[PDB]
Paper text:
DExD/H-box RNA helicases, from virus and bacteria to eukaryotes, play important roles in processes including ribosome biogenesis, RNA processing and folding, ribonucleoprotein (RNP) remodeling, RNA nuclear export, the regulation of RNA translation and transcription, and nonsense-mediated RNA decay. DExD/H-box proteins often contain accessory regulatory domains and localization modules, but their cores consist of two RecA-like domains joined by a short flexible linker. The N-terminal domain is commonly referred to as conserved domain-1, or [name]-domain, and the C-terminal domain as conserved domain-2, or helicase domain. Both domains contribute to the binding site for RNA substrates and both contribute to ATP hydrolysis. We used X-ray crystallography to determine the structures of the [name]-domains of DDX2A, DDX2B, DDX5, DDX10, DDX18, DDX20, [name], DDX52, and DDX53, as well as the helicase domains of DDX25 and DDX41.
[name] is involved in pre-rRNA processing. It interacts with NOP132 which recruits pre-rRNA processing proteins to the region within the nucleolus were rRNA is transcribed. The 6th residue upstream of the conserved glutamine is an aromatic residue in most [name]-box helicases. Its side chain stacks with the nucleotide base, stabilizing it in its position. Interestingly this residue is not conserved: While phenylalanine is most common, DDX10 has a tyrosine and [name] has a tryptophan in the corresponding position. In the crystal complexes with either ADP or AMP the loop closes up, resulting in a shift in Cα-atom positions by up to 3.5 Å between the ATP- and the AMP-states, or by up to 2.5 Å between the ADP- and the AMP-state. Inspection of the RNA complexes of DDX19, vasa, and eIF4AIII shows that the conserved motif that makes the most extensive contacts with the RNA-backbone phosphates is motif Ib. In two of our [name]-domain crystal structures, anions from the crystallization buffers are bound to motif Ib (a sulfate in DDX5, and a phosphate in [name]) highlighting the ability of this motif to bind polyanions.
Numbering used by the authors: 11 to 230
Write the structure that this text describes.
Amino acid sequence: TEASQPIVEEEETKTFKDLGVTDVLCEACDQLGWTKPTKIQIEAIPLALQGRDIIGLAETGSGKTGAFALPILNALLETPQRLFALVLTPTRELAFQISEQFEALGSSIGVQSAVIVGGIDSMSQSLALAKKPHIIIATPGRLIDHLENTKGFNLRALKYLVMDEADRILNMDFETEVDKILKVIPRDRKTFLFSATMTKKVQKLQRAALKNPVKCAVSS
Ligand SMILES: Nc1ncnc2c1ncn2[C@@H]1O[C@H](COP(=O)(O)O)[C@@H](O)[C@H]1O
């Protein structure tokens, strides 16, 4: 069930290409100054590219965003589709930070993202959703506001779900909102869940939201 932790020689030598990342995305990494993959990237990317669900035990600073963004963008290039991936976050700040990385990696290949968070007028958000972005990065309550109230908005097309900082999502009282979202997305999708630790509450969510996941743990 557990991913192979990278050892010192592998940290020193692995490339993004070695992980299976397509050439145009290897170039985007270089352009960002991502010249070596992090350990969570080395663990999760090949498994995700093979189509495995992922549970990542990792925190900011580990490179967890690239560990899910790169496989999502790789698949998007293979099979372009709007409303392709949803990333859920506990906070609006993390949503903007994740969008910065998707835009940095994907803007030049034409990938469109939309951030859907509190503190922003709903009419700009409804327009952004009508424009059918490839990626939506949202906090759970604001996403449900749009699922309930924004005409024509739904997640039936989704191929990827990410729950980033899932321990914090649950600790911030979004259990019901997450459960509601899980009811109105497709079962046939790829899913990532990242958390700083495994707890009973996180294990309940992973058993509800992931299929045969590989556990990828790092300390840095
Ligand atoms: N392979 C990498 N090489 C250099 N920097 C990276 C790499 N992956 C992620 N980063 C940066 O690490 C920071 C923390 O990312 P994260 O741990 O996803 O919150 C962000 O500023 C990323 O741009």
